[model samples]
Target: FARLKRSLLKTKENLGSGFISLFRGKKIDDDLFEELEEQLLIADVGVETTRKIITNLTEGASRKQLRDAEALYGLLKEEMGEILAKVDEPLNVEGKAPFVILMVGVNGVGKTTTIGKLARQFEQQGKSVMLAAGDTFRAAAVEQLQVWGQRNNIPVIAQHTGADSASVIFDAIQAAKARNIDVLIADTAGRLQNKSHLMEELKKIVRVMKKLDVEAPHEVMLTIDASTGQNAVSQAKLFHEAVGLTGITLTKLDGTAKGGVIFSVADQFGIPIRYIGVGERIEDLRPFKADDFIEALFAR
Candidate 1:
């Protein structure tokens, strides 16, 4: 994902130069540790996680009796890389006949767009895909998915506005099963007007899917907008509590310096980060790889 290099330009400013200057031929001391802590926090690495990183590095520094600041910088990079490495998993749809992925997120988090891009990517892999327009409350969402399906020649299962979301996904699963589609990506409404209602709506979809295949809705994926900063953390908590999110897709990395939120998410939930959206093109939605992300962030 070389795209990460360009997309992370904003994040590199703070996490990049800030660390570079701090570590440039400096000595190991309390001030350096404090500065590193500040830099991590400024990068939106979350309070708890930032503390964890500091503690780990401080312990390592003292234990090893390291002398050079550059060595500590290497440790910080390795630490960040390990945080991402733990969740560096790619989505696989080959195990089941129709690997159903239920997308959940708040409005404006690029849920629908992520679906479109993912469907295109899956199709490019030579798999037959079906789209389920489960965001019935918003008629535009259904229409948007329908248009995307039409243009891409992929099938989209949808019903009238205000229709039952669970039924739409149920019917989509049935259609995919009959057609033997390789992947089924379902889109859900991102309404936070009523938390319980949103949670119940998503739970209901999962329940209905189980009626057909015990393990249906195989993957519950949450889409987070990196530009939202710490708000992304709360959204993940909200959705994960609702559906036990199996994967994550972080979007808008190209526009935000707070891409460090990814570290917070990984540290907090440890859910597999399946993909990252760097730009508008389909190719921009690359599979998440820990080393690539760390390299991009640390790139000067």
Candidate 2:
């Protein structure tokens, strides 16, 4: 939980600077609104997102309601919170056995570590889980996943580097079915930015899952590095286009001040943000709650 708390605090720090500066002035003016817009854009909120936020602020100011900095900040938080609240769908792991989740992200986005934390959470809930190290191209992605499997006391199925990643997932599904596992989490290689190849690889993996069960790999999760700021939204767009992402898991939130990127992504894409990495601890991956996040961002 330390990671989550710290991440939330860091995010607050980043947005807090701009929030304070915008509201600290004696009177709100066009120049003040421009400066506020620039601050949000510099913090990696995309142009479109910043425009939307500014529009909301302008509307509020026109109503003769935003009198001071505190009120202005509160309005900002409320608008952002409303955008995020709609996309705050938690992971639904109900009665489906071998509830399969396919985790994907760009390289170095903490995909494997997120999987480990997720496995630990499931284990703690008394659900028997299996992991598939399908990222066969990376130097030590397989080994890293193996370490996570052992650390979490969960079994992992993996193949040698350069092997067919889909094949590893196939085997993992078989293993899960044989063991009566309740959940199976599969990791895949983080592909380059080339859209065609990434889409093809993801589609092939999904096809392979169909060989096991028609509805296998029920959840396709995309991981994003919140510290990347606005680029996080771009990455989400690319991944969503490639695989039609069902949800998102944001990592490195504790280290970035651009935590508002989460809200931007949710607002723009409408893909539910299921989990957030607040810290480096195992329990740091917490289900995203809108009120908790809004409170953290606005908390003094």
Best TM-score among the predictions, by candidate number = 1
How does model 2 score by TM-score? 0.92
Model 1: per-residue Cα lDDT over 1-300, one tens digit each: 467788988777667544787788999889988888887887788998999898989888988999888778777888888999999988888868799999999888879989999998998989999999999989888999999799889999999999999999999999999999999999998988798999999999999999789989889999999899899999999989878899999998897889788899999999999998888899898899888888888876
Cα misplacement distance, residue 169 of candidate 2 (Å)? 0.9
Q: Total clashes, candidate 2?
A: 5
C-alpha TM-score for every candidate:
0.97, 0.92
Pairs clashing within candidate 2? 3-278, 3-279, 4-278, 4-279, 7-254
Q: Which stretches of candidate 2 lie over 4 Å from their true place?
A: 1-6, 14-18, 64-69
Question: Candidate 1, residue 248: CA error in Å?
Answer: 0.3
**lDDT, candidate 1, residue 94?**
88
Provide the overall lDDT of each model, using Cα atoms, as 2-decimal numbers. Answer: 0.89, 0.81
